[PDB]
UniProtKB/Swiss-Prot annotation:
Ranges spanned by the short sequence motif 9aaTAD, renumbered to the chain: 249-257
Protein name as annotated: Peroxisome proliferator-activated receptor gamma
Family as reported in the entry's similarity comment: Belongs to the nuclear hormone receptor family. NR1 subfamily.
Lineage of source species: Eukaryota, Metazoa, Chordata, Craniata, Vertebrata
UniProt GO BP: BMP signaling pathway; cell differentiation; cell fate commitment; cell maturation; cellular response to hypoxia; cellular response to insulin stimulus; cellular response to low-density lipoprotein particle stimulus; epithelial cell differentiation
Organism from which the protein derives: Homo sapiens
Keywords, sorted A to Z: Activator, Biological rhythms, Cytoplasm, Diabetes mellitus, Disease variant, DNA-binding, Glycoprotein, Isopeptide bond, Metal-binding, Nucleus, Obesity, Phosphoprotein, Receptor, Transcription, Transcription regulation, Ubl conjugation, Zinc, Zinc-finger
Length: 257
């Protein structure tokens, strides 16, 4: 019954709003710097960076550890969103951990696209805007940490998804079932099928003119996988080049290679 799929879409959108303080709709109102009620301060070099906390260790490391704390906060938000996905908390506890362990970064890069345009990325809840060129000029091991996310984002953002689309989509991601180590794949897959059914109807109704958006969105889930592996490879390099630099445990636990 399609009525039950709209109810599910509505439930997930509502819970997405409640779980994620900075939505795509807000991010776009800020980036399209004409709804000029709170425009961001723009960090594009190191002096602007120093004026940054005049409004909002080494600089590459300092930025890296700020991005690190923001991912920790993002994991907390995604985890709270996951508990609202119907059936998720009824799954075996080990599979809950495993679904979050693998789904969390794919979601993070999906949502981080909402905060990006080709030029840069919103930061500090939207108060700031760090330019892509600045991040790309960062010292050696760090300058290329964000570029593949920007590359994904400019293409993903071309789908023109809105938050109500994304709420279903990140739910689909969490409930994969092809994750390594899942103890009971079948109840996961049944939840995902209902989610997939809900996404499909949602894209049909929300984007009637956008041909095969559902297929094209599902195909973006391979871009996400590659971002993750590239990232964990980049982390291993940092763990050995800077043995003085601490990684948050929540993020350490998520990263089991
Ligand atoms: C430092 C985070 C401030 C607390 C709330 C943050 C709200 C979410 C938005 C941006 C987080 C700030 C990111 C800090 C610099 C890293 C750049 C990045 O990769 O996003």
């Amino acid at each position: 019954e399609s009525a039950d799929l709209r109810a599910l879409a509505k439930h997930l959108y509502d819970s997405y709003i409640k779980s994620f303080p900075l939505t795509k709709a807000k991010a776009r109102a800020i980036l399209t710097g004409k709804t000029t009620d709170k425009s961001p301060f723009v960090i594009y070099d190191m002096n602007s960076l120093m004026m940054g906390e005049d409004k909002i260790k080494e600089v590459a490391i300092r930025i890296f550890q700020g991005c690190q704390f923001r991912s920790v906060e993002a994991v907390q938000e995604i985890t709270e969103y996951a508990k609202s996905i119907p059936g998720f908390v009824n799954l075996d506890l080990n599979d809950q951990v495993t679904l979050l362990k693998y789904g969390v970064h794919e979601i993070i890069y999906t949502m981080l696209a909402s905060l990006m345009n080709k030029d840069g990325v919103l930061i500090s809840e939207g108060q700031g805007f760090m330019t892509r060129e600045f991040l790309k000029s960062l010292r050696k091991p760090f300058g290329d940490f964000m570029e593949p996310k920007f590359e994904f984002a400019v293409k993903f953002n071309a789908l023109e998804l809105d938050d109500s689309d994304l709420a279903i989509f990140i739910a689909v991601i969490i409930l994969s079932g092809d994750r390594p180590g899942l103890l009971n794949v079948k109840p996961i897959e049944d939840i995902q099928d209902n989610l997939l059914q809900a996404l499909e109807l949602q894209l049909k109704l929300n984007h009637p003119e956008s041909s095969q958006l559902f297929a094209k969105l599902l195909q973006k889930m391979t871009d996400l996988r590659q971002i993750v592996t590239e990232h964990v490879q980049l982390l291993q390099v940092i763990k050995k080049t800077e043995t003085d630099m601490s990684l948050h445990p929540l993020l350490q636990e998520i990263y089991k290679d």
